[PDB]
Design an enzyme around this catalytic site. Structure first.
Site, PDB file in Angstrom:
ATOM      1  N   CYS A  92       0.812  -1.219   0.000  1.00 53.78           N
ATOM      2  CA  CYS A  92       0.000   0.000   0.000  1.00 53.78           C
ATOM      3  C   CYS A  92       0.849   1.274   0.000  1.00 53.78           C
ATOM      4  CB  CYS A  92      -0.955   0.018   1.200  1.00 53.78           C
ATOM      5  SG  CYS A  92      -2.227  -1.269   1.200  1.00 53.78           S
ATOM      6  N   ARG A 149      -1.158   4.900 -16.757  1.00 53.26           N
ATOM      7  CA  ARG A 149      -1.321   4.505 -15.344  1.00 53.26           C
ATOM      8  C   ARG A 149      -0.024   4.663 -14.535  1.00 53.26           C
ATOM      9  NH1 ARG A 149      -1.463  -0.207 -18.313  1.00 53.26           N
ATOM     10  NH2 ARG A 149       0.441  -1.464 -18.093  1.00 53.26           N
ATOM     11  N   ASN A 150       1.117   4.610 -15.217  1.00 54.95           N
ATOM     12  CA  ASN A 150       2.420   4.586 -14.552  1.00 54.95           C
ATOM     13  C   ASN A 150       3.191   5.907 -14.588  1.00 54.95           C
ATOM     14  OD1 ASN A 150       2.139   1.911 -13.612  1.00 54.95           O
ATOM     15  ND2 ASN A 150       2.839   1.095 -15.585  1.00 54.95           N
ATOM     16  N   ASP A 155       6.669   4.673 -11.424  1.00 48.33           N
ATOM     17  CA  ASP A 155       6.612   3.208 -11.452  1.00 48.33           C
ATOM     18  C   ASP A 155       7.927   2.560 -11.897  1.00 48.33           C
ATOM     19  OD1 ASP A 155       5.249   0.591 -11.318  1.00 48.33           O
ATOM     20  OD2 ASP A 155       5.300   0.668 -13.517  1.00 48.33           O
ATOM     21  N   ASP A 188       7.670  -0.816 -18.347  1.00 43.65           N
ATOM     22  CA  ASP A 188       6.236  -0.724 -18.073  1.00 43.65           C
ATOM     23  C   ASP A 188       5.683   0.705 -18.214  1.00 43.65           C
ATOM     24  OD1 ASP A 188       3.680  -1.638 -17.499  1.00 43.65           O
ATOM     25  OD2 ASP A 188       4.019  -1.830 -15.339  1.00 43.65           O
TER      26      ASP A 188
HETATM   27  C1  L5G Z   1      -2.622  11.219  -4.287  1.00 38.16           C
HETATM   28  O1  L5G Z   1      -2.571   9.788  -4.405  1.00 38.16           O
HETATM   29  C2  L5G Z   1      -1.345   9.209  -4.607  1.00 38.16           C
HETATM   30  C3  L5G Z   1      -1.299   7.814  -4.674  1.00 38.16           C
HETATM   31  C4  L5G Z   1      -0.090   7.149  -4.871  1.00 38.16           C
HETATM   32  C5  L5G Z   1       1.085   7.879  -5.017  1.00 38.16           C
HETATM   33  C6  L5G Z   1       2.299   7.225  -5.225  1.00 38.16           C
HETATM   34  O2  L5G Z   1       2.331   5.855  -5.275  1.00 38.16           O
HETATM   35  C7  L5G Z   1       3.543   5.237  -5.832  1.00 38.16           C
HETATM   36  C8  L5G Z   1       3.761   5.197  -7.211  1.00 38.16           C
HETATM   37  N1  L5G Z   1       4.940   5.341  -7.819  1.00 38.16           N
HETATM   38  N2  L5G Z   1       4.794   5.257  -9.048  1.00 38.16           N
HETATM   39  C9  L5G Z   1       3.514   5.048  -9.371  1.00 38.16           C
HETATM   40  C10 L5G Z   1       2.846   4.885 -10.581  1.00 38.16           C
HETATM   41  C11 L5G Z   1       1.476   4.688 -10.523  1.00 38.16           C
HETATM   42  C12 L5G Z   1       0.845   4.660  -9.278  1.00 38.16           C
HETATM   43  C13 L5G Z   1      -0.529   4.453  -9.168  1.00 38.16           C
HETATM   44  C14 L5G Z   1      -1.122   4.484  -7.901  1.00 38.16           C
HETATM   45  C15 L5G Z   1      -2.492   4.271  -7.757  1.00 38.16           C
HETATM   46  C16 L5G Z   1      -3.272   4.014  -8.885  1.00 38.16           C
HETATM   47  C17 L5G Z   1      -2.682   3.972 -10.151  1.00 38.16           C
HETATM   48  C18 L5G Z   1      -1.314   4.192 -10.295  1.00 38.16           C
HETATM   49  N3  L5G Z   1       1.566   4.822  -8.152  1.00 38.16           N
HETATM   50  N4  L5G Z   1       2.788   5.006  -8.180  1.00 38.16           N
HETATM   51  C19 L5G Z   1       3.450   8.002  -5.365  1.00 38.16           C
HETATM   52  C20 L5G Z   1       3.355   9.395  -5.300  1.00 38.16           C
HETATM   53  N5  L5G Z   1       2.185   9.986  -5.101  1.00 38.16           N
HETATM   54  C21 L5G Z   1       1.050   9.280  -4.958  1.00 38.16           C
HETATM   55  C22 L5G Z   1      -0.163   9.945  -4.753  1.00 38.16           C
END
Ligand code: L5G
Length: 278
Positions: A38, A141-142, A155, A137
């Site tokens: 998470c 989405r990433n 990502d 990847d």
């Molecule tokens: C405001 O809400 C968020 C949620 C997750 C975050 C985060 O998660 C790590 C992460 N690192 N690289 C990636 C690439 C894609 C996704 C991702 C997450 C959920 C849904 C779809 C894609 N997260 N992700 C990093 C920085 N800011 C964030 C802010």
């Protein structure tokens, strides 16, 4: 255990490690869900996203990975703040992932905005590719957006995960692959290159111009190779400029070596972008 690291990297440990007294993490609300763990709000006072690796190797390797990633610095690449199971500390991206943002009935990006999101991704990838780094990847989405709507390639490294499991299929090596973003040769060999990132980027441009439509929805998983080899590509979206579609077709060249570099993509897209107003 500093002795187990490459002696070159020992000095960089103090700059990647976050002392637990410096980090507050809000485990009360999940903001992102990945397969490996998470994501939560964190205060470092700078706002950050703290990724757990709960759901999931060599601690030395984990550190080397983080040291590599912290040295990366580009406005269109997600940085690593540090590490604190170990917690991954990333800048907070207010507007989430690119795909959800363009799908959102709130916010009304123009065609120029959308092309600009693409240009930003291209510059981030140009930086990554110059560091000889293959993303593997790349998809909408990433990539993520901050408070100033700055798009960042994300990502990767310690941030790498499957954040939308729907788009990953089991291959035979049990690898779970993003088949609809993959180049012909990667589907065949499971080898990923910068030129296969370029194919993925073309699909990303298509996502942008459709405002986050799923690619090839009437194709089932690995039957994608068959579909493509029939002589097919994703169709030109209504609002996608002709020269931008020509760019996508170049990204999907059958010969990996003939696809454009990310530098050339930045050049070509900057030009198309400049022709628009608003
Ligand atoms: C405001 O809400 C968020 C949620 C997750 C975050 C985060 O998660 C790590 C992460 N690192 N690289 C990636 C690439 C894609 C996704 C991702 C997450 C959920 C849904 C779809 C894609 N997260 N992700 C990093 C920085 N800011 C964030 C802010």
């Amino acid at each position: 255990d500093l002795s187990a690291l490459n002696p070159e990297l020992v000095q960089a440990v103090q700059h990647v490690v976050i002392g637990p007294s410096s980090l507050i993490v809000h485990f009360n609300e999940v903001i992102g869900r990945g397969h490996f763990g998470c994501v939560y709000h964190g205060t470092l006072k700078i706002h950050c996203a703290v990724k757990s690796l709960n759901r999931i190797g060599e601690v030395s390797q984990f550190l080397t990975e983080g040291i590599i990633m912290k040295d990366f610095s580009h406005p269109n690449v997600l940085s690593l703040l540090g590490i604190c199971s170990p917690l991954v500390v990333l800048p907070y991206m207010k507007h989430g992932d690119l795909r959800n943002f363009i799908r959102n009935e709130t916010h009304n990006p123009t065609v120029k905005d959308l092309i600009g999101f693409g240009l930003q991704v291209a510059k981030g990838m140009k930086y990554l590719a110059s560091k000889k780094f293959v993303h593997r990847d790349l998809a909408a989405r990433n990539c993520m957006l901050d408070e100033k709507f700055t798009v960042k390639v994300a990502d990767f490294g310690l941030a790498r995960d499957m954040y939308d499991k729907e788009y990953y299929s089991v291959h035979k090596t049990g690898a779970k692959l993003p088949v609809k973003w993959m180049a012909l040769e990667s589907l065949q060999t499971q080898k990923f290159t910068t030129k296969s990132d370029v194919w993925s980027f073309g699909v990303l441009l298509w996502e942008l111009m459709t405002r986050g439509a799923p690619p090839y929805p009437d194709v089932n998983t690995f039957d994608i190779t068959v579909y493509l080899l029939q002589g097919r590509r994703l169709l030109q979206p209504e609002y996608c400029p002709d020269p931008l579609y020509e760019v996508m077709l170049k990204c999907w060249h059958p010969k990996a070596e003939m696809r454009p570099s990310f530098s050339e993509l930045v050049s070509r897209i900057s030009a198309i972008f400049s022709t628009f107003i608003g």
